[PDB]
Every structure is written in C-alpha cells, then in structure tokens.
C-alpha cells in the first residue's frame, strides 16, 4: 500500500534522474568515427572430439588451452594451436550448462542441472585429474561458473541467486539475491572487484563481491537475457536477450547506451563477447551463425556463418588472437 | 622436428580412441525423459521396474536411463533446451483428477505447451493412465461431465476412458510428426516395462528409417 507506492515513487524519481542526464544525441557522437568497414574471418581450426551437443567453453589465461563441455558427459581440454586433446575429464552428471577455467590454469569447474559445482584439479601428482571439490547448496540449477582466484569462485543458479564460495571450505561465503527469475548468465569485471548477472526478469544487476548488495539494476530488455559480457575497460557491459536485441549499458550513466538489432533477425542471442579493444561485439544467434557488430557504431560488420546448428558458446582469447565458437553441431571452430 | 610433440599427438589419439569407445558404448543406452502429476500416480509406474535423480535399469539388452522432473520446480521453458534429442518422454496421467480439487485442465495445458515446443516439435511421448481401481467406482458415482461439458455417454471404462484418451491424444497440434500412443497400467502382470521397450524400439526404428533417407 503506502510502502509499495513509496517504492514506485522512488523508481519514478530515479528514472527521471537518469532521463535528465540522457543528453546522448548518439547519432552525432559516432558519425565522426570512421566505420571499421567489413571484417572477414575463417575457421583456422576445427576441434572434433565431442559426439554430442556442446554447451560451454572457456579460454585459459595463456590463450592456448580451452575447456569445452558437452552433453555426452565429458569435458575436454584442447591445445588450440595443435588441435590436440590434453585432458578428457569424464564428469558425473551428463547434463552440464557451464564450464570454467582457472586463471592460473590449475583447476577447471563444471556444473548444470545437478546443482553441484564440481571443481577438478589438473596440475597434480599421480597423473590423472581428480575431482577436488563439489560445491553444493544451490536450490535451482547451475548456469554460470566463474573463477576469481584459485580459491574464490562465483556461481549463478536458476533459483534467482548468485553465490561466492571458498573452494577450500566448500561453503557459500557470500550470497547475492535480488532477482525475481532464473539467473542465466554471469560475467566478472576485469579487475574482479564486481560482477554483473542477467536473469529472466529482463534486468541485469551489478554486484560488488566485497559488500554483497546490488549496486545498480538495469532494465530495457523485453524478454529473458541469456548472455552478459563485460566491456574491456570495465565501465560497461553488453546483454543479449531472446528478442534478437543486444544492448550496451554503461555503469556510470546507468542507462542503455546502445542497442544492436536488425529487422531480419528474430531468433535469440546465446552468447555475447567483446574484442580486446572493445570495438567489435561478437553475438552468437540461434540462426546457426554469429554476427560481428561495430560496438561504437551499431552496424553489422561481419558474419561467422560456418556452423550446421545453433551456436551455444562463444569466447575470445585474452590476447584477442582468436574467437572460439561452439555449437550444437558437436564441433567448435576457431576463427581469426 | 616435433621432439616430444609426437608423444603429445599420440596421447591425443589414445584419448580420442577412448572417447570414440565411450560414445559407442553410450549409443546403446536409451534416455527417457519423465513428467507427470505431482505425487498422484508417479509411485505406481516406478514400482514396475537435489537437482535430478536418474534411475538406471536394463531390459532385454537395452540400458534405460530415466530422468524425472519431480525433483526440480522451476520454469519449464528454461530447461527444455537441455532435453532436446531425448529418445522419448513418459508422461504419466492419473484418472482420479477429473473430480479432484481442476487438475485435468492444468495437465492438458501442460500437454499443449510440451507438444508444440520449439525443440520438442519431433520427440515422441508415451503416456500411462493409472489408478484404475478408483476409476472403477468413481465413474458410476460421479459422471465424467464434470470436466467434459461437451461429452455425454455411458459412465463406463469402455467408453468414457476412451473419450478421455481420444481427447488427450488429440491435444497435440503437430500430430503427423510425433506419435502419441498409450498403454494401460496393470498392478498384476508387470508388462509395462515390456511396453516401454516396444515403444522405444518403434521410436528408434522410425528415427533411423527417417535418417537413412526415404
């Protein structure tokens, strides 16, 4: 009653406050910048070892090794240069949504419908990789796992929550809960001091790991958002949703800076990532291909049409030398 | 020239052989998605033979893995992409919900939602109607018109249940791609596993017949 109306009034006043600062005229800021033109990339290598649908991939910080997870029940670590398979970790629950690579290269993480974030140790004696830990406590389903350090990992679950754990103790050290729908995507800032999460509410929330409260909330999407990626500078992020629309938001402006959509695409976004310089925005649609947008100009600059099914995962190397796209076609391509 | 890179290549080939062998072994295992009403008759068919609980058994040289949905309570469309390509969906139904405090409308709405999905436009669904012991005497006492205003006929298992089956099997909108066929659960003569085997056999026959051409 009174409290709900007060909350509505606060929402209206913050909306007006952000609308007052909306002096973009962005049709006049990007016209001076010379367009990138048209880029062309080809599949330098094709990694063919999965015999089911692959769901996630993640690059290592060395920009050579990459982990890929598939429905067949095994996640395999690829040497991207030589197409070799370094490890073939057989996981317990065949249904997996996400995989992660530790920045140090020592551990990998996996999870999915089992509601368990399994952490495997690669660099060990005795030879084979072993399941180091099994983080448990989520009541939904694991959707995105990201590594902060070798000891801190942030996960997102389908029960409208995110958590920050300690791997050594295997307990939720911090819990973030402000969403009203299944949280589907999660992205860490380059400084790893804060992250952003997107859920079915068509709202992306910005959390700081140290505090635990949603610093900002961004709206504008009409449907569920499936992908979040941080801008390389850390002061912006991009969201791809099910309505064929990418939206670039800026943390300081607290508004929708840019929108990327075309009249001829109606299918949904599955993954979004930036290039090293942030000029290119890679979007993996459900049209069995990927698009490359000019981030500063919102003009479609390229198409990565090389997959025989929908592209489910998309990643860019830390040095920005290659883009690995994995699809339900059971192969992942590496474009350059 | 490739001093110990040759050993890395050999290791890759060896684990690739292991991958191929494991996948070939997995291709002989059939995955069955499971749905059903909440704690209505899900305890009956399971007697014939966290996030997700997978039940594994084997019947006539075929490994059946069954994944139920009663362990997860969330939005159905957000996990429906994970089950694309599953062999078949077993959707249990209880006939005691026609006069219950109502459930038939939700069940048929769920059937409509699941039979027209973006990913489930081709998967086949088996369905078993259970709790016939109650149905023996609840039909004469309470006519079936409570949930079927447009239906009128004899209050007997021969015709009323036939009408319910016809309505349920007509609830699908793409009827020429996915086959919807039914068996009757029996407390004695536990042949329901045999019917599941025959249904998945027919599903595989049609799948590879389509895949080979023609």
């Amino acid at each position: 009653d009174q409290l709900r109306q007060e909350a509505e009034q606060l929402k209206n006043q913050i909306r007006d406050a952000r609308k007052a600062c909306a002096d973009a005229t962005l049709s006049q800021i990007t016209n001076n910048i010379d367009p990138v033109g048209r880029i062309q990339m080809r599949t330098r290598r094709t990694l063919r070892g999965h015999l089911a649908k692959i769901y996630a991939m993640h690059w290592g910080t060395d920009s050579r090794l990459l982990v890929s997870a598939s429905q067949d029940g095994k996640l395999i670590i690829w040497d991207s240069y030589t197409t070799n398979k370094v490890h073939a970790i057989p996981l317990r629950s065949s249904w997996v949504m996400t995989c992660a690579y530790a920045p140090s290269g020592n551990y990998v993480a996996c999870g999915g419908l089992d509601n368990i974030c399994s952490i495997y140790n690669l660099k060990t004696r005795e030879g084979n990789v072993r399941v180091s830990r099994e983080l448990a406590g989520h009541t939904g389903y694991l959707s995105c796992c990201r590594f902060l350090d070798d000891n801190q990992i942030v996960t997102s679950s389908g029960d409208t929550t995110c958590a920050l754990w300690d791997i050594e103790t295997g307990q939720q050290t911090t819990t973030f809960t402000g969403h009203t729908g299944d949280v589907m995507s999660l992205s860490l800032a380059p400084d790893t001091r804060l992250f952003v999460s997107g859920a079915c509410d068509a709202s992306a929330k910005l959390w700081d790991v140290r505090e635990g409260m949603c610093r900002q909330t961004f709206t504008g999407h009409e449907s569920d958002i499936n992908a979040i990626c941080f801008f390389p500078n850390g002061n912006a992020f991009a969201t791809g949703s099910d309505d064929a629309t990418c939206r670039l938001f800026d943390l300081r402006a607290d508004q929708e800076l840019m929108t990327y959509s075309h009249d001829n695409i109606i299918c949904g976004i599955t993954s979004v990532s930036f290039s090293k310089s942030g000029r290119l925005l890679l979007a993996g649609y459900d049209d069995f291909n990927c698009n490359v947008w000019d981030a500063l100009k919102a003009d479609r600059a390229g198409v990565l049409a090389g997959h025989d099914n929908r592209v489910s995962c998309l990643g860019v190397t830390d040095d920005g030398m290659a883009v690995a796209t994995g699809s339900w076609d059971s192969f992942l391509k590496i474009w350059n | 020239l490739s001093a110990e890179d040759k050993a890395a290549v050999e290791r890759s080939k060896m684990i690739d052989r292991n991958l191929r062998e494991d996948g070939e072994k997995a291709a002989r295992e059939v995955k069955l998605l499971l749905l059903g009403a909440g704690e209505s008759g899900k305890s009956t068919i399971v007697k014939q033979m966290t996030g997700i609980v997978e039940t594994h058994f084997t019947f006539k040289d075929l490994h059946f893995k069954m994944f139920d949905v009663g362990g997860q309570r969330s939005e159905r469309k957000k996990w429906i992409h994970c089950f694309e390509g599953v062999t078949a969906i077993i959707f249990c139904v209880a006939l005691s919900d026609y006069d219950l405090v109502n459930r038939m409308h939700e069940s048929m709405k769920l059937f409509d939602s699941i039979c027209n999905n973006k990913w489930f436009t081709d998967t086949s669904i088996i369905l078993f109607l259970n709790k016939k012991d109650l149905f023996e005497e609840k039909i004469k006492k309470s006519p079936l018109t409570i949930c079927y205003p447009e239906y009128a006929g004899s209050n007997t298992y021969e015709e009323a249940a036939a009408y319910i089956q016809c309505q349920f099997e007509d609830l699908n909108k793409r009827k020429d791609t996915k086959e919807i066929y039914t068996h009757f659960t029996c407390a004695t003569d536990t042949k329901n596993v045999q019917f599941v085997f025959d249904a998945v056999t027919d599903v595989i026959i049609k799948n590879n017949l389509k895949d080979c051409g023609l």
Partner: single-chain antibody
Amino acid sequence: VQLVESGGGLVQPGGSRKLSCSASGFAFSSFGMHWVRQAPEKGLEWVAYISSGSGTIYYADTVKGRFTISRDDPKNTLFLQMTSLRSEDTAMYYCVRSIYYYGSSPFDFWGQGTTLTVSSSDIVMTQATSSVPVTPGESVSISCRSSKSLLHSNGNTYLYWFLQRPGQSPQLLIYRMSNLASGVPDRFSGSGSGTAFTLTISRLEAEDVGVYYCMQHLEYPLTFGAGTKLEL
C-alpha cells in the same frame, strides 16, 4: 609416488636377465617409462623408452637388438629383458616416469635403481667443468654446451637439469631450461640460448652438494652431459 627396481645381481657375460620396475601411487598406464643406467663411476646413459599404451618403443644404439622393454599396465609393472650381456652393461638401472602433453614435466620422478654387475649424429651434450669450489651462502653458475641448437621452431628449448646427491637417486631440477620442477626451491634458475645453457644457484645451502647433469630431449637418443660435481 613410488618406483622400485628389482632383478639385479651378478650375471655371467653372454647371459640373460630380467629387470622389473614396480610402480605405485600414480596412474601408471598414462605415463611413458624410460630405463636410464649409470656406470659405476661415470654419468647417466639413456637405455630405452616405451610410450603410453606401448605404441612407441625406442632403444639406444649400444643396446639395440639385445634389450627388450615392455610393460604390464594391469599389474603396474615395467620389464627390461637383457640378452648377451657384456661387461659394458655393468651399471645401476633407474626406472623413470614421464608424461607428455602441453606443459607437462617429463622425467619428474626416478626410481631408486638396481645394480647389475657382469663379470669380465647423436647430439653431444659436451660438459666443460667437472668441479667447482663450493662455499655455502654464495651463488654458483654451471654451464652446459650443446653440439646442436636445442631451440625448436615451437619455441621450446628442450634442456633438462637434474641433480644427483651423494648416494641418492637423481631428481628433476629444471625442465625446458626455464621451468622449475615441483617442490624444488626458488634458488635454482636456468637460462641460455641454443647451444649454450646455464644453471644458477643463489644463496647456496647444504644438501645441494652433488652432480649436476644436463640432458637433451630434442631427439632420440637422449644424451646426458659428463657431469659437474660440487664439493665443499
């Protein structure tokens, strides 16, 4: 991790003998296994190698034909059958585990070895210095000379530094000329270019007294240096 050698002893020349290596504590079937021997008063000499899955077998020229290396993965054992033994085969044999993928650490664990006494264009890893005076707390540099450039087109400089303490099995100090092995302290460091390598020790302590060997892995057969001995 544990590797135990057995089957040594006294053998008449021209006879045959079987050496067995029992493995414990690691996934034996995922490791290549080397037999490396050391003469009674000389350096290390590589004998034979068998890969994972027995898909590749290599021998040394002085032992080819007379020796046969095999493995039993289910029993976690490695076998070296030796025929027509000569006085030149009188040595202590070590069973060495190795594993090859992007970023692995081959030759990272050696067995205790067994003694066998018989009564009576390979890359030359030339070694210059046989001994240096040693004072604890100082820094010592050791040099290794290679007849061929160990740098490869993939950027890896396949040079390995091992240390053998008095009366002890050798351990891996450095692999590929710039990587410290597992458990070794940070005092040890390695550097160099093709055909010129250096191992440097800062703040020398005790237990570092021993023989330092440089080995190449650019191509079979693998060859060791003569050996540099540090004495107080």
